[PDB]
Amino acid sequence: TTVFQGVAGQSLQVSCPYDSMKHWGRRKAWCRQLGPCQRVVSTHNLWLLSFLRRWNGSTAITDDTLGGTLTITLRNLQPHDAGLYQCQSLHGSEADTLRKVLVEVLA
Amino acid sequence: TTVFQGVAGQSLQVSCPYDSMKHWGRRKAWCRQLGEGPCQRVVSTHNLWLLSFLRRWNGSTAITDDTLGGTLTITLRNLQPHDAGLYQCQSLHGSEADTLRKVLVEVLA
Amino acid sequence: TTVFQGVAGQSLQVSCPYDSMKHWGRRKAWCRQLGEKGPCQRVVSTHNLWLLSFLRRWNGSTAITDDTLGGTLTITLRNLQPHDAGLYQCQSLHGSEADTLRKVLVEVL
Amino acid sequence: DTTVFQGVAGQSLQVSCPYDSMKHWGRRKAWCRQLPCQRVVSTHNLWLLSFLRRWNGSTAITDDTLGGTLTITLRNLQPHDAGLYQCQSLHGSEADTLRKVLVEVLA
Amino acid sequence: TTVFQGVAGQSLQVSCPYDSMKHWGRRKAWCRQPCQRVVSTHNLWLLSFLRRWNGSTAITDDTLGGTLTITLRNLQPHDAGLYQCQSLHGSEADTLRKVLVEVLA
Amino acid sequence: TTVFQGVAGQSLQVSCPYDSMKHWGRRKAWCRQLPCQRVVSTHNLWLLSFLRRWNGSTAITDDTLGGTLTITLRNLQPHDAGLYQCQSLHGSEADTLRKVLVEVLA
Ligand SMILES: CCCCCC(=O)OC[C@H](COP(=O)(O)OC[C@H](N)C(=O)O)OC(=O)CCCCC
Numbered sequence: 001t002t003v004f005q006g007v008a009g010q011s012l013q014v015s016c017p018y019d020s021m022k023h024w025g026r027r028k029a030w031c032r033q034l035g036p037c038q039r040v041v042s043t044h045n046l047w048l049l050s051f052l053r054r055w056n057g058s059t060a061i062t063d064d065t066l067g068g069t070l071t072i073t074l075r076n077l078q079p080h081d082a083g084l085y086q087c088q089s090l091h092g093s094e095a096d097t098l099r100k101v102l103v104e105v106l107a
Numbered sequence: 108t109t110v111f112q113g114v115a116g117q118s119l120q121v122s123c124p125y126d127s128m129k130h131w132g133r134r135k136a137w138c139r140q141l142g143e144g145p146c147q148r149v150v151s152t153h154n155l156w157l158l159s160f161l162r163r164w165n166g167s168t169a170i171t172d173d174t175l176g177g178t179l180t181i182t183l184r185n186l187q188p189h190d191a192g193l194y195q196c197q198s199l200h201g202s203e204a205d206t207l208r209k210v211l212v213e214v215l216a
Numbered sequence: 217t218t219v220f221q222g223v224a225g226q227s228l229q230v231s232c233p234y235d236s237m238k239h240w241g242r243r244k245a246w247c248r249q250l251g252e253k254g255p256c257q258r259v260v261s262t263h264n265l266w267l268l269s270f271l272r273r274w275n276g277s278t279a280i281t282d283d284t285l286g287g288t289l290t291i292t293l294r295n296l297q298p299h300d301a302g303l304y305q306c307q308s309l310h311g312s313e314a315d316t317l318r319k320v321l322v323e324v325l
Numbered sequence: 326d327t328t329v330f331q332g333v334a335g336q337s338l339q340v341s342c343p344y345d346s347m348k349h350w351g352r353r354k355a356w357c358r359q360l361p362c363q364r365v366v367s368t369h370n371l372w373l374l375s376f377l378r379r380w381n382g383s384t385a386i387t388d389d390t391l392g393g394t395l396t397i398t399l400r401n402l403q404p405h406d407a408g409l410y411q412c413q414s415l416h417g418s419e420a421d422t423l424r425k426v427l428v429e430v431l432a
Numbered sequence: 433t434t435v436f437q438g439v440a441g442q443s444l445q446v447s448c449p450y451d452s453m454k455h456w457g458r459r460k461a462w463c464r465q466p467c468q469r470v471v472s473t474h475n476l477w478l479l480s481f482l483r484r485w486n487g488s489t490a491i492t493d494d495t496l497g498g499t500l501t502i503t504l505r506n507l508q509p510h511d512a513g514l515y516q517c518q519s520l521h522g523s524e525a526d527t528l529r530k531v532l533v534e535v536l537a
Numbered sequence: 538t539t540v541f542q543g544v545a546g547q548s549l550q551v552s553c554p555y556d557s558m559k560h561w562g563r564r565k566a567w568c569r570q571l572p573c574q575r576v577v578s579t580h581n582l583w584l585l586s587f588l589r590r591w592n593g594s595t596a597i598t599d600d601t602l603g604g605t606l607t608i609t610l611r612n613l614q615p616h617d618a619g620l621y622q623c624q625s626l627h628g629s630e631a632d633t634l635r636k637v638l639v640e641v642l643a
Pocket residue numbers: 044045046049052127128131174175176177
């Protein structure tokens with residue numbers, strides 16, 4: 001369950017490697033454990049345009065489906081952003097965990 | 108119904124998330140709901156849906172739409188008591204409208 | 217003031233957040249604040265066409281791209297050397313005035 | 326010469342190589358590992374599309390020929406990735422070293 | 433011949449690199465040893481990235497980077513053998529790689 | 538005027554900034570004063586301005602997005618020293634962008 005450390009007021013990049021054949025054709029999402037893991041942002045609904053950056057407030061997501069890497073950007077990282085999060089692979093109504101991330105905010 | 112509060116004289120930003128695939132191609136509106144009952148148009152996104160990013164104004168209220176992320180943003184520039192109220196974020200189609208969000212704008216002195 | 221540090225000889229990525237509505241429609245610049253609150257000297261600016269702000273512009277060993285939807289300006293100092301150390305400003309241009317978005321100390325390890 | 330890049334294990338590491346854009350105008354580039362240096366990945370065969378990201382396994386490369394920067398991404402960096410590498414500029418059968426790089430990995 | 437070995441009842445991913453300019457426009461095929469076709473990439477070469485199936489074997493092609501990927505799903509001892517990656521042009525088929533697939537229980 | 542100084546025998550790189558909007562669509566030239574004799578111009582197709590053009594051991598290339606014109610003086614000699622112009626062409630005329638003084642040393 002990986003640790004990503006960032007400087008406060010700067011953009012923190014979170015990277016989630018995944019098996020690109022096993023998760024072929026699947027949309028991804030980023031969520032924050034609140035309890036339940038609640039949806040922050042997801043990749044483009046059109047899987048062939050997953051490379052396109054999608055924003056939700058101060059979080060962005062982009063997916064490189066060929067290389068099998070999902071990147072999340074926490075813009076303007078604030079101490080209130082520290083906590084547990086998940087990269088997930090979507091399919092049907094299910095979500096599989098690609099990676100569990102702890103975010104920490106320095107100073 | 109979610110409350111958005113801001114101080115008088117400062118910009119208040121209201122956000123309405125929406126499912127961007129479901130609302131693909133649909134213009135959006137911000138309107139004042141008096142009654143259960145008349146919904147009065149304040150401002151709408153550009154007539155050309157590919158230009159929905161363009162910031163459109165009525166008086167001191169602005170609206171822009173990020174159609175890719177699925178976020179409508181309404182800005183109430185110099186928030187005053189007469190802005191307080193119940194509002195709708197709507198998705199337009201024909202002369203119909205679906206309600207994306209109900210918002211209460213409150214003003215703090 | 218926020219501090220970004222990097223290793224000499226490698227690229228250093230600086231990012232400046234801003235309010236995308238407040239500075240809607242504006243070009244950005246990165247400049248070096250050469251002493252006092254005296255001369256802030258232009259290093260690089262975003263594309264002359266605001267709708268093309270996402271295109272990387274180079275001046276010398278500095279690049280810039282703006283994400284006007286997320287409200288984040290990104291500056292790349294290629295091949296960072298001790299001479300690049302110092303105080304800089306991300307700015308928003310309007311008319312021929314400039315507002316400071318953020319002050320950045322570049323430190324070189 | 327040799328520059329050092331450290332990155333954390335299980336996260337993506339970005340290596341950058343500056344070069345002179347006039348001196349290497351028109352040339353393709355490559356990234357290789359010292360074991361002599363074995364090719365890991367090269368830039369697009371069409372020089373005008375050097376900006377396009379190319380993968381080979383867990384390594385990617387892209388070239389900004391205007392700015393004179395070659396970027397190499399080591400995805401899901403593993404302790405076995407530690408070692409010595411070169412950025413090179415290709416002309417006919419010859420490969421000029423742009424930079425020697427040491428990759429270190431951490432906890 | 434390169435050797436690819438996988439645990440039985442799991443996915444084995446075989447990779448065949450090739451020169452992307454040299455094989456520009458060419459579909460590929462995965463064949464078993466005469467070589468008997470198992471699966472080939474999409475008829476429309478601009479969709480070579482699409483995964484095509486024959487039973488539990490898949491094929492997908494990255495024509496930009498020059499990597500052909502064959503996946504053998506739920507690998508079994510009866511998948512063990514000698515196979516070919518090929519590049520089709522006309523009714524010709526040129527050998528890109530010989531691959532030895534081996535299974536462990 | 539701006540001075541670019543390079544050591545004998547090595548390539549010297551002269552850069553000329555310009556406003557890319559103002560000079561949109563226009564070819565550029567490097568010319569040498571004695572009256573200014575033209576040495577090399579950017580490609581006749583402006584969309585191909587990035588193309589390194591030559592005349593002997595002088596190269597010209599233009600970045601029309603950033604507004605940076607780049608002249609290369611390869612194998613620099615003592616006689617390459619003196620006065621030059623970066624110019625922007627339009628119809629018959631030629632606006633000056635920068636006057637460049639090149640000094641050598643060894
Ligand atoms: C840089 C090259 C990429 C091409 C850039 C490009 O095409 O813009 C992407 C758009 C942006 O998405 P929408 O604004 O439609 O939102 C709704 C959307 N359903 C969503 O999930 O966000 O997506 C399309 O649906 C385009 C259709 C055809 C495109 C070929």
